[model samples]
Target: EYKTKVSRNSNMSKLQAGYLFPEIARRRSAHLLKYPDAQVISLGIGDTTEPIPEVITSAMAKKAHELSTIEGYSGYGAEQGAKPLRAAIAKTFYGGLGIGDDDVFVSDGAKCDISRLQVMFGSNVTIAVQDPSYPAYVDSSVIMGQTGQFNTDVQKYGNIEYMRCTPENGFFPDLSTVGRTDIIFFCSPNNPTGAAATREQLTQLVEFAKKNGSIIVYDSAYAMYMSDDNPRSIFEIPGAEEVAMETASFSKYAGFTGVRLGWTVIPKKLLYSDGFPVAKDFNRIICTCFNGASNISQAGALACLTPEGLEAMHKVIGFYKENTNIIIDTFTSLGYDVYGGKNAPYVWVHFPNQSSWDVFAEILEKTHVVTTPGSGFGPGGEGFVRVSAFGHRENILEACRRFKQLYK
Candidate 1:
């Protein structure tokens, strides 16, 4: 028998109990054990229920077929990404924002790229994340050993900063409270809260980062859902390029959650205080750590940037937007405090007098509706629950009906 004991990285111990979504699954499983016949409808996880539009899939199919032929065969694409796709992303997404093709780095998904970004920065930098934010930003930082020990009392890591977003501030972080930090993870049309920052707010964010010499790792994964007047990309603000890097995805917008396609933008001009180009170092990190996003997915992503593909993508986004509206309307009618569900596919319902976990469990038991407990997000999220609108219209309507029947 092999008897050598392998030592685990001490950083692994810093992670919270399972990740947020998995813990939701654990509670869901426990509920099913007691009520095995329950027809549970999950409004917790932010997973897409829609299929990829035919235009994108057809393009991917054609590309996959080409791989078998001598004329169109490809092996090991450039680590940064294939040029055609990179150009398409820059042109279609960033458009006239001065984002060149070279500025884009294609990745399998924004989630994976965020972690890769953490890997590039390592433990040397201090990090700040939006409170009630996506768990990945904070958890990834912990894995990188950037945070000190987790403090249960304050419900935050010793070294990491949490920028609180609440109703009073319109869900935008108070930049004044955030002191000097090396990296700031800002997600607009934010996950969990579904808050979209206005251009003015983002301009303030950019200025704050610049003043503090902080690099904003902006997550615009839900940018496509923005209504009129909301900024789609941080680069829309002048001077943002000097202090911001952006990660965007086709997951929520194009229903490419399963297809796995996203991009990161690091302007060539962005530099560290030492005058080193941030993009150059990030490019080295990509080439060293990642082979490349799948070529087949790249083909689909390239199609997503085309005129016809963009039209089809908007149709799917419209469908989800209607679902979000339904959630917002239902909660509003019930007189329960609700935030978001306007430009994003999530509704954050606040329950000041109830424990978030208890609310989650109660909804599951009474209505067979699964919800994400807000406490799973962060300390600021303790008295709330997040409802995802990534479900079929029928499921959403039925879930709302059940909620009304129980509470109304």
Candidate 2:
């Protein structure tokens, strides 16, 4: 008798139990088993729950209609991105900041581009990230074989620097203590923290990157949510173009979470160790690995940058901003420490001395409302839980009422 077996990628095996979101899902599933009739309101995931602006969707519809005609039908497009869409994105987001259409490469979404960027960096590179960063940053490195085995005791991976970001230091790492690495994964208005770095802080970051000769992969996916002392694009800081690349998406602002369009900008001045341009290598990588983003998505994305569409998208963003305000008010009145929900769609609440998992569990059972355990993001997040502000008004009010009942 002959037996067949397959050898899998060893890197995949290095990943811990689950990505943060799925781990939240597994617990939610078990909670459902215990109380089948309970209605749970999720303030966990960041997926935009509102309808996409019609102005944006209308463009997609028109594009879809155009594809049915001979003159308008265009199959494959530039793997980098549609020329007009690239120009539009550059002008809309990074105008006067020195980013050009040629620097922007559109893609399916930020998450997918993250993986591609990891492949571009390869396993030989070293990297650092904010503790309590979006899990994908850590998990993707594990998948790329960039990390050593996970250390259960410390809850960290060997060889990867987990720069601690806590309220004490104002959620920005102390650069003096950070060792050198090839890349730094920085997210403004950070995922779990929901705190956007100010222009002064960002300038310091650019300075730090230059000091270490490290490239920064900046995630501005939540840029539109900012209403505070923040720069929407890292390039707004002088000298950033040489060391920082930015990734942003239309997911939250225009409610295009499911429609899937994002762009990454690698400036022409960025270079590799051998002094070769980084954008050229990145463009080559994109052309080889990505066929293209949806043509309809690109067309609609282009439309959304227009004045009318921006106004329409602004209204949608305003809704979630209102939801965030409500969350901040409720949490603040409940006598808990709350950060964010001002410039970001996340409200990170501190339950000092309480384990985040315990807080999440207790809140779920008592309130039947869903929240994300902060520790799921990193060790530094242990005493906090991340509450998302992307829900319908009635649901947000309902969740708030439940929370008051439990905590009060």
Candidate 3:
């Protein structure tokens, strides 16, 4: 019995695809070695492949130089974020939605914030995550010991609820299926799929959250990618401020993938389990655990939220949007079922009768284009694959060309 326990311990349960990307990297390398001259174009990873624009880079360099100076030396800023940057975020981001400065919390990245936030919510709290959603949401819950073993046949886990998002409902889940969950995770201009929830759809989710006494972890990481006039912030909904906390990042717009500057907003009205205001308590969460983002990085982040910085970032975001058009148009013309690409930079494609990973492997082997298999996200994702549109124009066009070859 002890030996069995020891062996089981060796195989600690972890979120799916925590290691899949590395394995993909390994396989891709082997392919490169074998076919050195193959003209490969990758559209798999959702990373901003473009270089940081001059506006942001110039600000970052100046900030870096300041950090290196003796008189300009600063130990640390507020764990929640630097005041100037925080103010900028509130003014530029939430101000558009009528949310105030005090509601926003500065942080490293939305990815980390979304995951680490579960720590405060407690393990007993139930979570509902979008199906075929970003793995971070469900994975973070699992790591905190809030979930049960995988149900391989159904392609879902045991404990947490899954809100199915598919073409039938325009990739927005029916929130009515969710019952009494303590927390809910949502992303618009969703990660794996590029679908953006309409005002009516998001309103429905908000009403559900309010009815269930649930908190919404609203991820607007891809908010910048949406080119529409739709409400950009969750707070736009009348009651969202009461139940929602938002996370946004500079990774997409500012190309700060390695720099790690993002913000979380918890309105003072946001409450704790006992219905007490949690803004003050959550502030302590940031201060005790995080030392705040680098002051130098915050300087650049401040610039990003500026009028000039915003205009420049919008130009870059527009480039990704056009890239999405190329992929979506090509895939649809090929008679394949594709979702997203209008208001988001992701294209979720269905592979008839083929599992998500199988298609992913086939794409990598044939075109050297890596893609995230839908199953890596959750059960509802099994037959789909998410291909990122965040790449160079040349590469995106090439991937589309390669995709056509597959259909032929």
Candidate 4:
């Protein structure tokens, strides 16, 4: 008998018992079973409901057609990305920032790139994250063995710095209080809170990282959703080129969540312990683990850079912005302490002295609507709920009515 049949990665055991969204899904299923006739609308996951505009879709169609023919067919591509896409991404997102096409690495999406960067950083490096951030950062850190046991009281793992982003601070954590970590995962136009950092806040962030010699993992997944003049890329900050790597996705902006396209920028100036170029190490890691992103996805991605394509995408973003505004109005009318929605497609509503999970349950049970509990994001979000604005206009309107009924 083989006493050691094989063991699972022990690090996996350190993660929360259920992922935030999955647990929400389970609760929804149970609610559905109880009220079979209920018509439910989800304001939970931030998934886009619109169709892709022809401006981008047609380009993908042409690429697919080319692959079927002998003259245009090709197999595989540069591990970094196709030259055209790399160039377009550089010009569109990082232009005038001293970052070039060679600095970009195409990937499936920013979420996965977060994991890839975590792997490259390995177990030895410590990590920090915004409280109530996208769950991927924390869970991925757990999986990579960069953390220890979770403390139920604080609802965070050891070896991880949970920088608090509360309403009092305008949703920006105080960098002065945080000592340092090798990696800092900061999301602008944040997911649950919907708070976009001001330009001064971002500059302070860059200065903090510079002083600590930390590598900031800036998540710009919702960069396009920003309503104000916030910098969409960290490289916009002076000296940030040497201290941060940015991961951004086409998912929210261009409705490519299912199509799966994204890129990570690693400035050539960023360095490691021995002053080795971090970009070179990232290139090597990507070359070994990832084939390029699907050519079809890149085809659409490239098309999205054009004026017509950008116009279409902005229309969708505008639609979502209107939806968020409606949700914000509803919550504000109900006299709830609401945060976010202007700069992001989610609204963070706070209920003093109430558990977020209980608020989530009551809304589902009474209104048959699904909204995410803020605590699912972290301990700091304990008394708040996150309502996603990514949905059809009609559904969002209906969800708002349901929300009103629940509060009434």
Q: Candidate 2: misplaced stretches above 4 Å? A: 1-5
- Candidate RMSDs in order: 1.3, 1.3, 2.7, 1.4
Cα displacement (Å) at residue 45, model 2: 0.5
Per-residue accuracy of model 3 over 51-168 as CA lDDT, tens digit each? 8878778887887877788986778666877667777788777776766766778778887787558777767778988887887777777777778876777766678888888889
Superior by lDDT: candidate 3 or candidate 4: 4
Tens digits of lDDT, candidate 2, 1-408? 976698789998888787888788888999999999889999988878888778888899999999999998999999899999899988889999998989999999999999999999999999999998899999999999899999989989889999988888889898889999999999988999988898988998999999999999999998898998679889999999899999998888888888999999999889998999988888889988999999999888988998998998888889989998999999999999898787898899999999899999999998888899998898887989999999999999999998888886
Pairs that clash in candidate 2: none
| Model 3 spans > 4 angstroms off | 1-20, 33-37, 96-98
* Candidate 4 C-alpha lDDT tens digits along 250-367: 9999999899999999998899979999998888899888888999999999999999999999999999999999999999999998999888888999999999999999899988
Q: Estimate each model's TM-score.
A: 0.97, 0.97, 0.93, 0.97
Score residue 388 of candidate 3 by CA lDDT.
85
Question: How far in Å is the alpha carbon of 11 misplaced in model 1?
Answer: 0.7
Judged by whole-model lDDT over C-alpha atoms, candidate 4 comes out at 0.91
Candidates' lDDT values, in order?
Answer: 0.90, 0.91, 0.80, 0.91
The better candidate by lDDT, 1 or 4, is 4
Can you write out model 1's per-residue Cα lDDT over 1-408, one digit (the tens) per residue? 676688788889987578888889888899899999998898989889988899999999999999999998999999888999999999888998989999999999999999999998989999989998999999899999998888888888778889999989999987888878999999998888989999899999999998999999999998888875789899999998899999988788778888888889999768998999999888999989999999999999888887899899899999998999999999899989999888788899988878898999889999989889888888888888999998989999999999899886
